[PDB]
Design a protein around this motif. Structure first.
Motif, PDB file in Angstrom:
ATOM      1  N   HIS A 163       0.882  18.968   5.358  1.00 36.03           N
ATOM      2  CA  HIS A 163       1.380  17.799   6.063  1.00 36.03           C
ATOM      3  C   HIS A 163       0.873  16.518   5.418  1.00 36.03           C
ATOM      4  CE1 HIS A 163       3.487  19.507   9.534  1.00 36.03           C
ATOM      5  NE2 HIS A 163       2.604  20.488   9.483  1.00 36.03           N
ATOM      6  N   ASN A 164       1.759  15.534   5.322  1.00 40.43           N
ATOM      7  CA  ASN A 164       1.462  14.288   4.636  1.00 40.43           C
ATOM      8  C   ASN A 164       0.587  13.388   5.501  1.00 40.43           C
ATOM      9  OD1 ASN A 164       1.800  13.074   2.145  1.00 40.43           O
ATOM     10  ND2 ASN A 164       3.478  11.764   2.849  1.00 40.43           N
ATOM     11  N   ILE A 165       0.121  12.292   4.896  1.00 43.85           N
ATOM     12  CA  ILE A 165      -0.590  11.265   5.649  1.00 43.85           C
ATOM     13  C   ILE A 165       0.372  10.554   6.596  1.00 43.85           C
ATOM     14  CG2 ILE A 165      -0.348   9.862   3.561  1.00 43.85           C
ATOM     15  CD1 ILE A 165      -2.651   8.171   4.450  1.00 43.85           C
ATOM     16  N   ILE A 210      -6.252  10.458   5.077  1.00 43.81           N
ATOM     17  CA  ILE A 210      -5.501  11.451   5.837  1.00 43.81           C
ATOM     18  C   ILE A 210      -6.407  12.113   6.869  1.00 43.81           C
ATOM     19  CG2 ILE A 210      -5.859  12.952   3.835  1.00 43.81           C
ATOM     20  CD1 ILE A 210      -3.510  14.605   4.672  1.00 43.81           C
ATOM     21  N   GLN A 254      -4.844   3.860  -3.120  1.00 49.09           N
ATOM     22  CA  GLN A 254      -5.047   3.178  -1.843  1.00 49.09           C
ATOM     23  C   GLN A 254      -6.543   3.220  -1.557  1.00 49.09           C
ATOM     24  OE1 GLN A 254      -2.392   5.203  -2.308  1.00 49.09           O
ATOM     25  NE2 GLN A 254      -0.846   3.584  -2.171  1.00 49.09           N
ATOM     26  N   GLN A 272      -1.728  19.273  -2.888  1.00 48.56           N
ATOM     27  CA  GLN A 272      -1.451  19.892  -1.594  1.00 48.56           C
ATOM     28  C   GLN A 272       0.059  19.837  -1.394  1.00 48.56           C
ATOM     29  OE1 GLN A 272      -4.134  17.892  -2.004  1.00 48.56           O
ATOM     30  NE2 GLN A 272      -5.665  19.503  -1.704  1.00 48.56           N
ATOM     31  N   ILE A 297      -7.810  11.059  14.444  1.00 48.93           N
ATOM     32  CA  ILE A 297      -7.253  10.218  15.502  1.00 48.93           C
ATOM     33  C   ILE A 297      -6.206  10.980  16.304  1.00 48.93           C
ATOM     34  CG2 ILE A 297      -5.793   8.188  15.869  1.00 48.93           C
ATOM     35  CD1 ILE A 297      -8.653   7.511  15.588  1.00 48.93           C
ATOM     36  N   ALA A 298      -5.346  11.742  15.620  1.00 54.44           N
ATOM     37  CA  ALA A 298      -4.347  12.548  16.311  1.00 54.44           C
ATOM     38  C   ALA A 298      -5.000  13.638  17.146  1.00 54.44           C
ATOM     39  CB  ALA A 298      -3.374  13.154  15.305  1.00 54.44           C
ATOM     40  N   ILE A 305       2.203  11.249  14.121  1.00 54.42           N
ATOM     41  CA  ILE A 305       1.708  12.040  15.248  1.00 54.42           C
ATOM     42  C   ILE A 305       0.705  11.240  16.071  1.00 54.42           C
ATOM     43  CG2 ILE A 305       0.276  14.050  15.791  1.00 54.42           C
ATOM     44  CD1 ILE A 305       3.118  14.740  15.382  1.00 54.42           C
ATOM     45  N   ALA A 306      -0.194  10.512  15.401  1.00 56.98           N
ATOM     46  CA  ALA A 306      -1.154   9.674  16.108  1.00 56.98           C
ATOM     47  C   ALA A 306      -0.460   8.545  16.852  1.00 56.98           C
ATOM     48  CB  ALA A 306      -2.183   9.116  15.132  1.00 56.98           C
ATOM     49  N   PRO A 328       0.791  -1.241   0.000  1.00 55.81           N
ATOM     50  CA  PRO A 328       0.000   0.000   0.000  1.00 55.81           C
ATOM     51  C   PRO A 328       0.818   1.284   0.000  1.00 55.81           C
ATOM     52  CG  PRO A 328      -1.113  -1.545   1.344  1.00 55.81           C
ATOM     53  CD  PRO A 328       0.125  -2.242   0.859  1.00 55.81           C
ATOM     54  N   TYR A 329       2.041   1.297   0.535  1.00 52.03           N
ATOM     55  CA  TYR A 329       2.832   2.518   0.544  1.00 52.03           C
ATOM     56  C   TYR A 329       4.271   2.358   0.081  1.00 52.03           C
ATOM     57  CZ  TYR A 329      -0.992   4.527   3.228  1.00 52.03           C
ATOM     58  OH  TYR A 329      -2.225   4.969   3.640  1.00 52.03           O
ATOM     59  N   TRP A 341      -6.477   9.970  10.099  1.00 55.10           N
ATOM     60  CA  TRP A 341      -5.345  10.118  10.998  1.00 55.10           C
ATOM     61  C   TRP A 341      -5.308  11.504  11.618  1.00 55.10           C
ATOM     62  CZ3 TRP A 341      -3.732   5.820  12.633  1.00 55.10           C
ATOM     63  CH2 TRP A 341      -3.688   4.702  11.799  1.00 55.10           C
ATOM     64  N   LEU A 392      -6.482  11.843  20.358  1.00 49.96           N
ATOM     65  CA  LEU A 392      -5.476  11.513  21.361  1.00 49.96           C
ATOM     66  C   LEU A 392      -4.831  12.764  21.946  1.00 49.96           C
ATOM     67  CD1 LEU A 392      -3.891   8.525  19.445  1.00 49.96           C
ATOM     68  CD2 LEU A 392      -5.740   8.475  21.095  1.00 49.96           C
ATOM     69  N   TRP A 417       0.630  12.542   9.915  1.00 42.93           N
ATOM     70  CA  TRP A 417      -0.450  12.352  10.869  1.00 42.93           C
ATOM     71  C   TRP A 417      -0.456  10.940  11.423  1.00 42.93           C
ATOM     72  CZ3 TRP A 417      -1.957  16.569  12.793  1.00 42.93           C
ATOM     73  CH2 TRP A 417      -2.045  17.723  12.016  1.00 42.93           C
ATOM     74  N   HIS A 418       0.026   9.970  10.641  1.00 46.15           N
ATOM     75  CA  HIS A 418       0.235   8.624  11.166  1.00 46.15           C
ATOM     76  C   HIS A 418       1.271   8.628  12.283  1.00 46.15           C
ATOM     77  CE1 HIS A 418       0.363   4.291  11.226  1.00 46.15           C
ATOM     78  NE2 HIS A 418      -0.432   4.210  10.176  1.00 46.15           N
TER      79      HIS A 418
END
Ligand SMILES: CCCCCCCCCC(=O)OC[C@@H](COP(=O)(O)OCC[N+](C)(C)C)OC(=O)CCCCCCCCC
Ligand SMILES: CCCCCCCCCC(=O)OC[C@@H](COP(=O)(O)OCC[N+](C)(C)C)OC(=O)CCCCCCCCC
Lengths: 731, 731
Positions: free
Chosen positions: A678-680, B680, B674, A674, B686-687, A686-687, A620-621, B683, B690, A683-684
């Motif tokens: 900030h990328n996905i 995005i 994906q 964009q 979710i961030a 950061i979470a 997936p990435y 996340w 939290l 945030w992954h």
């Protein structure tokens, strides 16, 4: 005026008598004086008149060396000993084998000190003006000290009395007796349960620091042995991969385009200090902290039974400055709180000066460089200059805080020590840990992309961090500060008198230094500050308990040698605990769980590695097949085409002959819609960081609550001894 | 055998004498018996022999109604009163105006109860076999109760004694005296500092619940008045927007494709209960909780001074079952812990049965429906069936836990009550709050996309939530459980005896109910469980303190009417606090801060609305100009083309004539690369969730620590009273 002391015998037959000239009664105190002076002489004679009228037996002795000083030996007979023992409720074991040896001379000294604090010295200008501390503050008496048993480096000439100071120096205070355990009942019996509980706390702190240092050197050895398995360091100073990164500049214009080949040795250290071993060690250190506190409460209750420290206190007589000086107290505490807030703002301004120095000297080191990179050298000299500022400011605040809490008026010595403890610990806390807090939590965490960088106050960009992370700089700052404080104390207290290298007992005890009205307080403060360096930043580097253990092992013996040889014999007191330092330690514990979790999450930069390993090397990435860490640097650092968001309009164009740079943030490539948000992956990450904070905080706090519930507050042996002494006292 | 009691006078002249037949000495206790019986008769006569030999004066009286029962009036003369008052260290105010009235009859009753517990009754088969509780457990005495002053609904005929029970019934226990404050010194004087501190705790709990209910109804009125400003509800039941959503089915095959037009009334309630008012109320409720605990500690210290509850206890005599019955204790506590763990697993299995019932009856309601939607009806009947299971299981565990803690052996009544408190509170906690915990935190939080749904155990999909959120279902479950428990207690205790509607004093006191060996404990438990409903789920709906306030106002008076009229007069005891319920309350507080934060974050579904308002209606992500909430439903719900990831292969095709559905998750559209991984926006949400947990937890805990540091543990008036009584006692 009447009832003068019995006149001077001045025979000076034995150098250490510890007895009167008749040889049947023991000296308990020594009062020193000299001889507009006529009213002070009448005052001293009236004090001694009321003293003999209370029942204490007295004797004078002129000094054989300097005839201006007169030494007054104070003995308590058995009758006033029993009356004031029933007054102040001293617990006793029974043995009437010797009336002189029924009370040890520590107890006799504190009884005579209570009697001297009760006696009124007839000055009724202000009515009922009384105290012995008022006399030594007024200067008519120079001191009111008790006597030591013997010299430390010799044997007592009198075979009747035990040479207890020599025994304590030979078994506890000698530096060639550093391996032996502390004889705690001898320390308690000779020095009171205020010094004895301090040295018991220090020995127990040394044992728990030994446990934490063993586990910390195990985790550091795991990191140092597993520094070859680390993939991203081997990728970052691979010349094919990291040498062609071409990282984007850090300052505005005077910083050049630099490649990521240069950080190899830095990353070669960084993988030792941000690995899984430091996470395991911090998770251990939370449990070690709650074990430390619970077993300290158990040891404190065991000492409370064994040293009977809970005996009934007196009405807490006020300070002589508060008696001599006396909405107003509200504006006084408001003014002193504003003063300490102003001083805290001064140390914040010093931190901002460290930031500005870091930026300017990084420009200077970058232009003077053509091993160590300019970033590491900048961090090292910044930590050195910072630690010098810490030492200067903490000495200056020591003087200023003494003056501040002397300006406002506390009632007693307990409230004075508590207020001084609060403001002194507040500034020592902020002063020592503010630079490390800024490095860990606010360094490189608020800078934007190189198209639109952030300016804190104008013309100064916020300082960017290395792509490995700011944990090496925090480790450098923490090691410099902690080792510099330890080496400073071991040069000041230990190396200085070591490189420096008939008369009666009272004259020898006079030519010494008194311990002061604060006493062990300052020493306590050092360990508490050292406790924060063990606890708040333990995930920075795991070798801090080892350095703290070495400093503590030397600190026990330098306090012992200070207390046995250098200092005068103090009046023994009673204390059930350490004081405000136990709530301060519990507060440092509760804060430092959160601080360790936020050091591993935000600073350590291992959560991006875990997220790239588990969720971003997958089809997936990522182009890889299974979970693997190779390709972390190329897929982590964001790509920047030279398009300034913005009036100078040339930060990178003047020195740039390459159209594309890379930078430590998680944003989109410039071809994206964009383009620089900030990328996905950001945030992954950061979470995952905040989920790690929540999970580690709740798990560690629940484990600490369950351990504090599972371990009893007092041991079973101490409960059995309490039951046995209660059952024997009932019969 | 010798020294029998003075024989029966049986004159029965006055119905309420509270005095012997001579009229000069007051009855303190009444011992009831009847007359293989010969050894028990010798046992009773030997007990009374040792009783008279200890010094208590005795009298017999045969019963005028039933001649089998004999009543033994027990009086203590003044001498044994002074000796056992010096033995058990009763604090006194001084007044020798009357020797009979120097000790109030509560103190006389507890003195005589101590004497009856000390007396040995000569049975030396097992040596030193002693106690009065052993006699009533053996059955040779039926009871050993003290006497009430008078009837509750009448006046005492004797004008000498105060009619204190009538005064307490008229001013405190009558339901037409519900508005008056509790007379706490009368309750304490008549009932001991174990009942008095309970009713003081209940009145103080009522005052703090009044404060919390005022603020909660303010926040609920804000939500109900601002239900028109809410944009997403107006969008979701707009027929143009929400009517054309065409949400994707919830079950496997037997659930049809449903539109989002149907949830309008549900969302019309949901915006009242997930707004900013509930967030403000939960942030307030943390501070209200720490105010509750700090002012309770202040009130407890004030009662500790005023009611002198710290008097010295005895050696805590063991239970008669432990005396009559006596590695083994370790395997006993292991077996009872495994039994309570098995019962906790049984209530977890009941929760799983509720889940399976929810799925099956949602299918049934969906097929039988052709207001209220099938989801709301399913939730309502599930909450009803669940609450019925809660009531059945808590009664059955009440019996089973009594049997379990009677199987293992505790030493004394304190340890027995503590073990019963621990296991009873553990199962009442899990039993009451497990369904609400599952609804809040694990309902719809683990279901995947409709291409690959998750199966918990096979053939049962995890239940999906409504696109507004599961907060309305949690509110419904919480309101049903709390209101059902309150209505159940107000039908059982209040409505039942209300719809139901010469002889001496001791005969009237015999025909009553004894309070039991546990006493107020069960009543305590209810309030503690009710405390969790005030505190753990307060962000579910803010009207729970109002219902708790109504139930508490009725509970004070039903406990008063139970205690004054229904129950026999108990022996007054001493207690400094409530017991284990104060550590249990502090644990519920510390857990419920976290529980409120996780209810607002995970369940309330207002953090996606805030994130869409601030960061996803902007030209980087949305077509809108400024921050606005319109377009939330169309840009929030994910789009699913019918492509099953997967062997039935037809969950939606058989009833589906539309090729595209929408579902409550944050995943990509099917045209994406994906295609069904997390977006995005997911996340980001979710961030933010939290981060809200971390920020709210640390802010609320720091505010609670600062408030517990700022408020003194004892009031200034109580410190002044302690100083004044110490200064008067010293003279
Ligand atoms: C209580 C004693 C010590 C407190 C220390 C406070 C720590 C503050 C952490 C901080 O400033 O992070 C702010 C943002 C940025 O996340 P980072 O991952 O640092 O982004 C920068 C890293 N990067 C250059 C490689 C891209 O991260 C977030 O957006 C999450 C915010 C959560 C803050 C929670 C702090 C608790 C306050 C009571
Ligand atoms: C301590 C007393 C009560 C404890 C209650 C535990 C609460 C568990 C919360 C939970 O299960 O969330 C798991 C995931 C899912 O995040 P959600 O936003 O719930 O995703 C589903 C919502 N959606 C259908 C609209 C897409 O969220 C995450 O990935 C974040 C995980 C953080 C868990 C922290 C729990 C603390 C454990 C000691």
């Amino acid at each position: 005026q009447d009832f003068r002391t019995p006149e001077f015998e001045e025979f000076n037959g034995k150098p250490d008598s510890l007895f009167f000239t008749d040889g049947q009664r023991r000296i308990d105190f020594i009062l020193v004086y000299e001889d507009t002076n006529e009213k002070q002489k009448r005052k001293r004679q009236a004090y001694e008149s009321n003293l003999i009228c209370h029942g204490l037996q007295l004797e004078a002795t002129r000094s054989v060396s300097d005839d201006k000083l007169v030494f007054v030996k104070v003995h308590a007979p058995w009758e006033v000993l029993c009356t004031y023992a029933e007054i102040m409720h001293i617990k006793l074991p029974f043995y009437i084998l010797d009336r002189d040896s029924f009370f040890n001379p520590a107890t006799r000294s504190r009884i005579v000190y209570f009697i001297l604090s009760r006696v009124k010295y007839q000055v009724m200008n202000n009515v009922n003006k009384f105290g012995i501390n008022r006399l030594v503050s007024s200067g008519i008496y120079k001191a009111a000290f008790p006597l030591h048993d013997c010299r430390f480096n010799y044997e007592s000439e009198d075979i009747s009395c035990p040479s207890e100071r020599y025994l304590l120096y030979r078994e506890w205070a000698h530096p060639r007796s550093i391996y032996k355990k502390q004889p705690l009942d001898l320390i308690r019996k000779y020095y009171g349960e205020k010094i004895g509980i301090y040295f018991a706390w220090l020995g127990y702190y040394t044992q728990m620091l030994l446990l934490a240092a063993v586990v910390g050197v195990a985790c550091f050895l795991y990191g140092y042995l597993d520094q070859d398995n680390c993939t991203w360091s081997k990728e970052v100073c691979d010349p094919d991969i990291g040498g062609q990164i071409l990282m984007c500049p850090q300052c505005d214009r005077l910083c050049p385009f630099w490649r990521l080949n240069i950080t190899c040795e830095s990353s070669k250290k960084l993988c030792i200090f941000d690995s899984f071993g430091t996470l395991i060690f911090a998770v251990f250190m939370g449990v070690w902290v709650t074990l430390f506190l619970e077993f300290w409460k158990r040891r404190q209750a065991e000492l409370e039974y064994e040293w009977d420290t809970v005996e009934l206190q007196q009405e807490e007589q006020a300070r002589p400055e508060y008696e001599a000086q006396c909405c107003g107290k509200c504006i006084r505490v408001t003014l002193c709180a504003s003063a300490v807030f102003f001083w805290i703002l001064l140390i914040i301004a010093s931190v901002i000066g460290i930031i500005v120095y870091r930026l300017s000297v990084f420009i200077v080191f970058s232009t003077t460089l053509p091993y160590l990179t300019p970033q590491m050298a900048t961090s090292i000299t910044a930590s050195i200059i910072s630690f010098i500022i810490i030492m200067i400011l903490n000495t200056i605040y020591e003087k200023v805080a003494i003056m501040i809490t002397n300006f406002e008026l506390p009632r007693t010595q307990t409230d004075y020590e508590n207020s001084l403890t609060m403001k002194m610990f507040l500034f020592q806390f902020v002063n020592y840990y503010s630079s490390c807090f800024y490095i860990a939590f606010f360094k490189g965490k608020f800078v934007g992309y190189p198209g639109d960088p952030v300016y804190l106050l104008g013309k100064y960009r916020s300082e960017e961090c290395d792509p490995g992370g700011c944990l090496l700089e925090l480790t450098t700052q923490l090691t410099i500060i902690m080792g510099g404080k330890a080496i400073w104390n071991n040069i000041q207290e230990v190396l200085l008198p070591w490189v420096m290298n008939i008369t009666p007992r009272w004259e020898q005890d006079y030519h010494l230094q008194p311990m002061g009205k604060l006493g062990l307080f300052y020493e306590y403060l050092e360990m508490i500050i050292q406790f924060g360096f063990v606890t708040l930043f333990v995930a920075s580097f795991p070798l801090a308990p080892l350095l703290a253990l070495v400093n503590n092992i030397l600190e026990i013996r330098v306090d012992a040698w200070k207390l046995t040889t250098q200092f005068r014999r103090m009046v023994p007191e009673k204390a059930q605990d350490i004081g405000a330092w136990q709530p301060i330690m519990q507060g440092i514990a509760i804060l430092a769980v959160v601080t360790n979790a936020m050091i591993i999450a935000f600073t350590s930069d291992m959560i991006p590695r875990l997220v790239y390993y588990w969720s971003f090397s997958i089809p997936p990435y990522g182009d890889h097949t299974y979970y693997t860490m190779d390709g972390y640097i190329n897929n982590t650092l964001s790509v920047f085409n030279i398009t300034d968001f913005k009036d100078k309009e040339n930060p990178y164009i003047g020195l740039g002959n390459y159209t594309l740079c890379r930078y430590r943030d998680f944003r989109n490539p410039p071809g994206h819609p964009q383009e620089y948000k900030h990328n996905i992956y950001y945030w992954h990450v950061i979470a995952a960081k905040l989920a790690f904070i929540i999970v580690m905080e709740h798990i560690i706090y629940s484990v600490k609550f369950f351990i504090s519930y599972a371990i009893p507050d007092v041991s079973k042996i101490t409960k059995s001894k309490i039951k046995r002494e209660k059952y024997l006292t009932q019969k």
